[PDB]
Write a protein that binds this ligand. Structure first.
Ligand code: VFN
Ligand code: VFN
Ligand code: VFN
Lengths: 258, 258, 258
């Protein structure tokens, strides 16, 4: 009983580790590297230059490491890097980067990418993200740790989904989602904060509330961004959690001279 | 060529009726049971424990019987039950139950589940339902007979879709959708009642109108749900058709004392 | 590398040009015609009667020429036509026509149909159209040249998407989209005009401006469509670019006598 199946295809150009298993009718293309204990299901298409890590699980009908259909991509040998302990569910589409950004699509550790979800070119996902069904990242989308993207959440190109943030099902995100913020609908509008996630991450009640006031300052208090950021400065100095929230709003805003 | 294509792999644990046709590069997993005249297309992945009824047609790229990715589910042996005369089109993802509900996903008889649709854990489906393209049922979703869910309809967990009720395309469903009621958009708002469904099911000239008056009480009259069920009480007792509508509202509401 | 892979199933009635590539585990059904230098990836189902033209690229997990699940279609011998120099990405579903319309679904040359998109019965696609991830054309939909349909755009049956027009991501199109208009939302509403589309297609600044003034008449001025098309007449006879726009509006509105 062999790890790699007789009906599967493995390129001698590819590099598979020890307990790497490849299900039947699965293509392991050239320049693909699969780390220790990773399991590849049946009818799975893997294309390189790709670097899949240790103990990931890639389900049937997923197309991982494919050239973007983007008219931007001219054929360049761009990469994709996948961490350890990721779950890439059925029919998930992961495309490699474009020379235009930094030639790389990057997925971290312990992420759960559910059915038909799209991780488009030059996107960067951290650790412990949950990407529910058909969640689509257009390209160059940066998804920080613990972000939850509810079913069919769509993200416009270049956006930044903050740490601990949450997007409601069928969300259309066109601007950066600050850390801990819960956005909902098409077009995504901020509703509140991921207090449940804060609890899960063992956040002190003092820090949870600091984050509740931190939201009210940015949104509810009628302040502008440039003002909210300035107000936040005190609470942000007192709470490393409020400081994550402020830095996410500071990195989203640049602006022009008047 | 014999019904079970030689390019297909069947678990010696599986039990298939003698006239069951299985296409090439398909997988019939352990504990999968398939009733008389059921046709399984090419590239279909069936995982057990699953009971598939009679005269069903399963199209290519479907992953029927697969474990839910939900962290709630820990690999507990739970079931999938599919009725008779169903159409599960291309790439339909049907997942098995979780021990938290009653460990079973249930699909009735004579239903049409279209391309890339999703029936998540414990979702219970009645009969003659049309579940249009990419429709997603998050988990523990109940769908009563005749119901029509337009393309890319998203239903939340624990939700109840009533009998003959229609949901417009792109619909994002949060609360219950009572029987006959047409709901549209993200978030789904009630608009009218499925009068074509009533016409198709030969509803008496009197019932159709009794149901139109019934929606008004609930919606258009500015009553509470408590007062709506009170006004409906008379008509529900006059017609078993309105009673089907009164019960969908009755079961959907409980609330707290005050 | 060989041209047609040993594990592919090529029906004896399918007619392929001498240099067609059919990947492993791909099915080329009866009455499927394949043009000079077309490429069919691994895991692709092609059903006839379908005519695929020259230098096309059909990708994995695609179902091209499958009968529509629609209840109006009763196993008729209806057709599907695909042009030349087209790209049909992973998981795309294209269905044949119904005898009801012209018994034919057609896709012209130079299109980009992105991952998991759907082309329903009797749909007619022009040339140089981009159809981003999971676009869904319910049926009888007409997409004209250079139309850009963003991620997860949903298009109701019998609709017309005009030349150079654009729908934003997660748009639910119910009424016709005139040529050049940028429509957004569920339900989709007209926002402006695809000016970037106009520059790319080398439009004269004199005619870009004429088209700006054109949208203004219809949408931004309080004119009834009757009055809109009347005011447009002058500009349309001066600018062929504006003429297209007048016609796209002309062809949508028929109306009933009053
Ligand atoms: N592990 C987990 C986990 C946690 C939070 C979410 C966010 N969430 C709520 C939810 N919680 N458990 C479940 N199954 O869903 C949704 O996205 C609902 S929409 C949806 C959901 C599932 C499938 C298709 C659709 Cl369309 C989703 C999954
Ligand atoms: N048999 C049937 C039947 C009945 C009602 C519906 C509900 N419906 C309208 C409609 N009626 N006939 C058709 N083809 O569509 C939609 O869902 C449109 S959206 C859509 C539709 C199809 C595919 C992808 C998408 Cl996105 C759909 C099918
Ligand atoms: N060739 C091209 C081309 C041109 C315009 C568009 C329109 N467009 C903006 C954009 N431009 N390049 C990219 N990748 O996106 C979107 O539709 C964003 S949404 C999205 C995007 C990609 C995948 C899934 C989703 Cl959901 C898209 C592609």
């Amino acid at each position: 009983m062999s790890l790699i199946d007789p009906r599967a295809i493995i390129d001698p150009s590819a590099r598979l580790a020890a307990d790497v298993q490849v299900g039947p009718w699965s293509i392991v293309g050239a320049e693909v590297e699969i780390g220790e204990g990773t399991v590849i299901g049946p009818h799975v298409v893997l294309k390189g230059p790709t670097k899949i890590g240790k103990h990931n699980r890639i389900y049937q009908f997923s197309s991982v490491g494919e050239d973007t259909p983007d008219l931007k991509y001219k054929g360049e040998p761009t990469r994709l890097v996948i961490g350890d302990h990721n779950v890439i569910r059925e029919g998930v589409t992961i495309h490699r980067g474009t020379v235009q950004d930094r030639a790389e699509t990057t997925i971290g550790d312990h992420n759960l990418i559910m059915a038909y979800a799209h991780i488009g070119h030059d996107s960067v996902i951290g650790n412990h993200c949950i990407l529910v069904n058909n969640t689509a990242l257009a390209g160059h989308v940066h998804v920080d740790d613990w972000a939850i993207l509810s079913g069919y959440t769509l993200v416009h190109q270049y956006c930044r989904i903050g740490a601990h943030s949450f997007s409601g099902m069928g969300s259309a995100i066109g601007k950066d989602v600050p850390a801990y913020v819960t956005v909902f609908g098409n077009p995504a509008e901020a509703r509140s904060m991921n207090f449940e996630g804060m609890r899960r991450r063992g956040f002190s009640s003092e820090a949870i509330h600091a984050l509740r006031r931190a939201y009210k300052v940015v949104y509810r208090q009628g302040h502008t961004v440039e003002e909210a950021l300035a107000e936040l400065a005190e609470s942000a100095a007192q709470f490393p959690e409020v400081a994550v929230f402020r830095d996410s709003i500071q990195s989203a805003t640049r602006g022009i001279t008047r």
